[PDB]
Amino acid sequence: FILLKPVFHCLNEILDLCHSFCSLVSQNLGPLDERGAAQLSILVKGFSRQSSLLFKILSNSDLAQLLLRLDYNKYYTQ
Amino acid sequence: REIITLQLGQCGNQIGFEFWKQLCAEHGISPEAIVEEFTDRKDVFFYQYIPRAVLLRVIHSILNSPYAKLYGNNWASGFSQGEKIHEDIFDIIDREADGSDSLEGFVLCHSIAGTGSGLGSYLLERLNDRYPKKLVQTYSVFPVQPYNSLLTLKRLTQNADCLVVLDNTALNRIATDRLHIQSFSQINQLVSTIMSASTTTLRYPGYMNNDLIGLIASLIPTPRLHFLMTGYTPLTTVLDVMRRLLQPKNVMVSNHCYIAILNIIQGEVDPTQVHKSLQRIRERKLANFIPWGPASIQVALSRKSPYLRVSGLMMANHTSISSLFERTCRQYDKLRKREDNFDEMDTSREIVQQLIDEYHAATRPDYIS
């Protein structure tokens, strides 16, 4: 999917997304109170949006991929 | 990233010695701890060769083996002696830690039945105290006997960040069926095949699964559900393998559904059909799963030792393991009515009951919250 622009420009957003989240958990050792929770709910509104956004994209080669993510039909409930 | 092993009690020391036997023979390392002439990255389990083992009557039998160059019964009786020689053994661990480049985990091999039960309980607490940054995987073995087992659980439920179960009663049944033994030295042979195959992807260089964290992190979703069970088919396409794994006659255990599944393929199978087997397997809907959490089935390839045909092992985190705990708790309650404070057993009785509920609650459509 390196040449397929739409998927490569959507998963890319998922890539740097985890950098922010993983840093958020590592940049402290206490509960998410000092505007961390305020920053936490920011990404889920975009991530889960980016999550189901990808879901419509796959609905030739994606059959081998979407099968693994959909083994428990969880995205079917999304 | 190196991982050191710890062997306690009779069972632990016996299987670990054999665990190395299968391991050293898997590589070209003669019993006298030297490479034979006759690829396989050996950094995780060997130092330059010498294995990173820490062993604790039976040592005479091992020192009399050709491998001389390769290096009470109550829970209260075991825990008491361990505190006395605390600083004695922790010298060994410390000197082995800094001698290692970057220590990663602590494999523990012991039986929950007697000195290994208490000493292991003492270790796990102290190990977490000094080292809070180290994974702790344990190869515990299941069978006054019930009291020793329940006390270990209280420690294993919160200290060990990972765990595998190996029950003898189920293992012994495999012996009379397919091996016709009626012997510990024989039933242990399967354990070595189980243990060695459990960590195949760590020694052979691959794309992923290059660390113990790379394996367990997929299975355990929450630090409360940190128990696994095993499966091993060869006792020949990939579909032939995955089908024979999920049969209840092969697993090593004595509504309910899986949480995550790992598949270890040690053969030379053609990797183009592997995604096809999952398709057909998913359609057959041969195995049920949780409805709350999105997960899948993990499959990973490997290569068999050329110095030694397709095998296969499966790692399972099944909520049916809660049934086993009930038997221990059910028996103990019978003992509590059959006969310095006797409250430590009572607190553990509570904390083990919590784990049974957590599994039972996990099979619900609304386990979360």
Add this chain to the structure above:
Amino acid sequence: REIITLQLGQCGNQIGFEFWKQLCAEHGISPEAIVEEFTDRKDVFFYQYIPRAVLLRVIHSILNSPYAKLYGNNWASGFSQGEKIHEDIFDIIDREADGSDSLEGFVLCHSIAGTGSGLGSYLLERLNDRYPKKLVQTYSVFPVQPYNSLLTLKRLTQNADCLVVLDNTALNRIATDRLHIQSFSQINQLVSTIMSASTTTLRYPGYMNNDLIGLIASLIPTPRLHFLMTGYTPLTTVLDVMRRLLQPKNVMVSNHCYIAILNIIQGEVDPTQVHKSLQRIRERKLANFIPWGPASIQVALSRKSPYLRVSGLMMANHTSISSLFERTCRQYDKLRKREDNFDEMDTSREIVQQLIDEYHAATRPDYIS
């Protein structure tokens, strides 16, 4: 879908053993249950090959046969002994059912003339208890014989989902005509040919009739009228076979009218002239049909086994079958006036009277209500 067969009594074992011999030779299956080298769908009746049989002295002579590698006289005595081994024989069936992919039905081969007849009546009821959604077709065979015959009739009229009658008096006359025998092993040759031919469209798949209910759903109009009779043309155009089956000197049965007809032509006949013949047979009016509802005649082709010419098989539903019950009925009354409650005989005598009353009223222009 699969179909499990049962063999009860001396007759069921013999005609079932001869059914499997013919069915093994019809396919490419050596007596050692191993496939020989030498299209035919054989998964329905064979398990990967193992027959799906449940056999119930005669067993020894079967086990001394070259096919060993292929696996009192009252009705009350035959009913009670089945109750004491109720749990026993079902474990064989319960494992074969769940071991089966998707069960469809239960073929029963038994003679109603006496331990086997009594055991059959018992098992026919319990299958209705456990499995509600499985067809039960019975290849019953007609002959204190009047007593046992009517009792099993009480169960065969409300338990068995279909029924194919084969009376010895019609088969023996055929053996003393074209066979010229003056033995049990001789007339069973004909019974095996009818049984093997009955399920021909199941093993060789075609455009239609790929399931057991597909053959039965056309003939049996209401759940009460579930009795069938057979016809073998040989003991060549398709117009000859049809006119050689409708004859009353070929039926295996010792006003009235037909309800539905099914024809099985197993030859290499020209499949383009089959629709022509049904255009002519209607004109000669060789058979009289029901006046209330619409009925027709059905012809289905197949392919003979190449490893072993035109043959035919006619399954019909004629209300003249009511006469056979009348003979057993009248024979019962004569013994009832000649010699803990003897009330079951009263209910059985009553319920078969309703079945006979259905037939004689099934031939009227107002069978509706």
Add this chain to the structure above:
Amino acid sequence: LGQGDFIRHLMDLLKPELVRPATTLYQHNLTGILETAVRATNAQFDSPEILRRLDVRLLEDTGWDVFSLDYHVDGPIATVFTRECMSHYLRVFNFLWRAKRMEYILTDIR
């Protein structure tokens, strides 16, 4: 539908799916069932080449109105079928699909 043995199993597996409306239907799910159906029937003993072309297509209600097989063919053999035989077979396949579910309904009632 000249096979009969394969279409029988294929109508038993699509029953839980096609009852839902078409909006929740996605092609990526039905293929899995189609591959399993070939194995579950006698169609497994077959030339691997012709089995590579047999797939599903989604006509554009209910799941029993948008399902149909395609069997696409390209190359030299495509000069015999010429995009019109494939626009005629599908015109036929509907009439053989309807007259096949109207029968398995009537053997379920029975």
